[PDB]
Ligand binder design. Structure first.
Ligand SMILES: N[C@@H](CCC(=O)N[C@@H](CS)C(=O)NCC(=O)O)C(=O)O
Ligand SMILES: [Mg+2]
Length: 93
C-alpha cells in the first residue's frame, strides 16, 4: 500500500454473508470508500438503506457490507474525503 493502508486485501464470501474492510492513513483527514468494477471509473458508495455502512473507529475507517450479493464484486479503496494506490478485492462466492 501507499500512504493509505487497507485490510484485508482480498475477501471471498458466500452470498448473503457480511464483510468488514478497514483503512487508515498517517495524514489528517477523513477517508471515504469507493468501489471499482474492472477498469471502470471508481464510484462513491451509497448506503442502500443501511446495507453498506461506513464508520470511523478512531483513526481507522471501516466499511461494512451486509447481505452480500453479485453487485458487491469489485475492488474497494479509500480516498481522502476532501483533498487539496492499493485496494481490497471482494469476490462473492
Ligand atoms: N457538511 C458537508 C461537508 C462540506 C465540506 O467540508 N466541503 C468541502 C469539500 S469536500 C469544502 O472545502 N467545501 C468549500 C466551501 O463550501 O466553500 C457535507 O456533508 O456535504
Ligand atoms: Mg486482485
Amino acid at each position: 500500500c501507499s500512504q493509505i493502508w487497507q485490510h484485508p486485501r482480498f475477501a471471498a464470501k458466500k452470498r448473503s454473508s457480511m464483510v468488514k474492510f478497514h483503512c487508515y492513513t498517517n495524514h489528517s483527514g477523513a477517508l471515504t470508500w469507493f468501489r471499482k468494477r474492472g477498469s471502470q471509473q471508481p464510484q462513491e458508495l451509497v448506503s442502500e438503506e443501511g446495507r453498506i455502512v461506513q464508520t470511523q473507529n478512531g483513526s481507522v475507517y471501516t466499511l461494512t457490507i451486509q447481505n452480500i450479493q453479485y453487485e458487491d464484486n469489485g475492488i474497494y479503496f479509500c480516498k481522502q474525503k476532501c483533498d487539496s494506490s492499493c485496494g481490497t478485492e471482494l469476490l462473492v462466492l
